[PDB]
Design a protein around this nucleic acid. Structure first.
Lengths: 173, 220, 53, 188
RNA sequence: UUACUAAGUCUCAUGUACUACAU
RNA sequence: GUGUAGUAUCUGUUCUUUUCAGUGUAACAACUGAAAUGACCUCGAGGCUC
């Protein structure tokens, strides 16, 4: 629907943008900001079409096409499980963490290693509350690399509430 | 106390409503919320202008600083008193001229903007830009490019826009199926000036009140 | 509906109604976006509201 | 108070300014283009500049500007006992300057053998599993494993007085010895 | 590619208009 | 080109007893009343704490 436009000369005005894009598709709205710190134009606009069909069309045909004031015009189109784990071994690599938690569940992102107190801790992002419950059940208070690690939910107070299972189930759905 | 804590949730109030999106969080403290939802959501009612709950006395507007002092309606500007008396930092006029401007020339004349049934003017709003907007949706049509934007685009005369080539591979605009452009669906020899294409409509009274004559009252 | 999240201002929370994550919670929850659901707070009520939709 | 500087009007289409911010609009008043604030006198202008308001807008504008030979060695397992429980001790022997005479380029040559506890949950064949192995490894020679059915043996409690040279892990420093002069690796 | 909102109250100073009242 | 009384409006400045309950408010705000002292734990936050 709405498309971002950038690399715009502040001398390009609103009527000029409108007359420009009406050549491509019908334009529902144009938001073309006006700086209250420079009293002019900050050189990027937003053109809301009547649908994402004309929007994407204008993205395809318009991108890297029109040359305005010698500068080219750019167009660009415009919640997970988290486990805190404490007392990790210094020999535990982030990739090793990835290998350890892959068997329990798919990771939406990579673990985050940080130090509290000296105290090696990490945040592990699971795509599933139930697979997170698996890594908890098996890995809680366990000895890896000759070091006892604790696996629980990271704080937001901590994850794993009743509404959390309900909505995380939906985000899975 | 108890009455303040007795209030139903706004979402509990939404279900009673056929148009639930108008109701807002403050409607929870409506002393008669089930009724106020029915009135506020009734067909033709026009919700209260929202400048209430602001203490700014409805105009603090920064935009108010930059508003134009005034502009004569062009029909009255024809009367030339603009030059006769300088309002910005004696002019003998004709009775027939002024009278005809209001009546002969300006009978059918009407302000271009006005407003609609439910139009309400909020502080930050300025009608003028929307007037040039509505007038511009009128004048400007696809296939035509003014000489100013053409010069900025650096497109010389007789040459097609750069999106005609990508429009050759991608195809005509989905929004304009009837659009014609020289060199592709439309005759290149008809390329003239600022118009490289035009929409060809495929579609091809008296309103019981047709006056069939127009006669204004004469001053003399 | 958002992580039982805390907000320090009413203007800000009124801005939460149009946001990436808030709409992600709605739409991924099965409650479709935009302007009917704006006044949402708890996850429960908007479920019956969406059944009304 | 103006210090003799000339502030050009906003419409005069910009000599370098002290602060390229305070201007005079079409009218005679003085304005801060960033702050969009009107100021009656140059004293009010200086109050604006010395005020936190203008500064915040300056920081916001700056933010806008930024925007393997595999050879099986010889192990010597032996049931040990001390006090107060039972522990295992292994005696692994290595080559007698037979083949290590061709490789001496200080390439991890100083690195002693290393041990790790591996779960059988992962094997090249993946058939049966459910027990641990006390794997011992050295660069040239082939790896070696020892099955540990007992959930825990000799797993001590603060043996030494908490000294922190992790080496590889608590296991290695805690309970291993590398007689490098004779090439004998003891583990218990 | 930055998807458009900030001042308020108090205090002690400066800026500017004004209202009755007297030579 | 003055004086007496008085008013409005900028701008600068700055954040007033941590909490609880009542009034009040569209919600705030504001107003009205009281007052914890001690110990401990993790990274100003947190306590089915005593």
């Amino acid at each position: 629907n709405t498309v971002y436009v950038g690399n715009i000369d502040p001398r390009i005005t609103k009527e000029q943008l409108y007359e420009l894009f009406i050549q491509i598709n019908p334009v529902l709205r144009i938001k073309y900001p006006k700086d209250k710190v420079l009293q002019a134009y900050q050189g990027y606009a937003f053109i809301e079409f009547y649908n994402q069909g004309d929007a994407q069309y204008a993205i395809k045909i318009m991108n890297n096409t029109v040359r305005l004031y010698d500068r080219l015009i750019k167009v660009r189109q415009v919640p997970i499980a988290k486990l805190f784990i404490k007392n990790l071994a210094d020999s535990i690599d982030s990739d090793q963490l990835v290998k350890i938690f892959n068997k329990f569940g798919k990771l939406i992102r990579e673990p985050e290693i940080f130090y509290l107190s000296k105290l090696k801790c990490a945040y592990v992002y699971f795509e599933d509350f139930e697979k997170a419950d698996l890594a908890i059940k098996s890995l809680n208070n366990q000895l890896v690399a000759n070091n006892r690690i604790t696996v629980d939910y990271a704080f937001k107070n901590g994850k794993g509430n009743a509404k959390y299972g309900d909505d995380v189930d939906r985000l899975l759905n | 106390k108890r009455r303040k804590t007795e209030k139903p949730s706004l979402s509990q109030l939404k279900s009673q409503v056929p148009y639930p999106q108008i109701i807002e969080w403050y409607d929870c403290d409506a002393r008669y919320p089930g009724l106020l939802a029915s009135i506020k959501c009734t067909k033709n009612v026009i919700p209260v202008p929202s400048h209430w709950q602001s203490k700014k006395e409805y105009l603090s507007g920064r935009s108010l600083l930059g508003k134009r002092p005034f502009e004569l309606p062009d029909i009255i500007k024809k009367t030339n008193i603009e030059q006769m008396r300088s309002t910005l930092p004696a002019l003998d006029l004709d009775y027939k001229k002024l009278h005809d401007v209001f009546f002969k020339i300006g009978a059918n004349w009407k302000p271009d903007h006005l407003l609609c049934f439910g139009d309400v003017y909020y502080e930050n709003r300025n009608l003028f830009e929307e007037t040039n907007w509505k007038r511009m949706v009128d004048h400007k049509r696809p296939g035509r490019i003014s000489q100013e934007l053409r010069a900025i685009m650096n497109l010389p005369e007789g040459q097609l826009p750069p999106w005609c080539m990508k429009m050759k591979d991608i195809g005509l605009p989905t929004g304009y199926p009837d659009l014609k452009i020289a060199g592709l669906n439309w005759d290149i020899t008809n390329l003239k000036g600022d118009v490289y294409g035009k929409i060809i409509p495929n579609h091809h009274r008296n309103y019981f009140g047709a006056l069939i004559s127009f006669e204004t009252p004469e001053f003399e | 509906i958002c992580s039982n999240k805390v907000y320090n201002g009413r203007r800000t929370f009124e801005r939460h109604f149009n946001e990436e994550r808030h709409i992600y919670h709605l739409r991924c929850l099965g409650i479709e976006p935009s302007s009917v659901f704006k006044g949402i707070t708890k996850i429960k009520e908007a479920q019956e509201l969406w059944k009304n939709m | 108070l103006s210090k003799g500087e000339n502030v050009p009007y906003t419409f005069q289409d910009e000599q370098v300014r002290s602060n390229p911010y305070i201007y005079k609009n079409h009218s005679g008043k003085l304005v801060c283009k960033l702050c969009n604030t009107m100021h009656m006198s140059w004293s009010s202008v200086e109050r604006h500049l010395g005020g936190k308001k203008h500064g915040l807008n300056v920081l916001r504008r700056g933010i806008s500007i930024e925007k393997x030979x595999x050879x099986x060695x010889x192990x010597x397992x032996x049931x040990x006992x001390x006090x107060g429980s039972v522990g295992l001790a292994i005696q692994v022997n290595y080559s007698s300057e037979v083949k290590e005479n061709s490789v001496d380029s200080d390439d991890k040559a100083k690195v002693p053998p290393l041990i790790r506890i591996v779960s059988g949950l992962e094997l090249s064949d993946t058939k049966q599993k459910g027990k641990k192995f006390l794997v011992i490894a050295y660069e040239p020679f082939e790896n070696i494993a020892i099955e540990l059915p007992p959930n825990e043996i000799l797993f001590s409690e603060n043996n030494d007085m908490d000294n922190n040279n992790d080496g590889v892990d608590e296991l290695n420093k805690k309970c291993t010895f590398w007689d490098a002069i004779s090439k004998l690796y003891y583990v218990q």
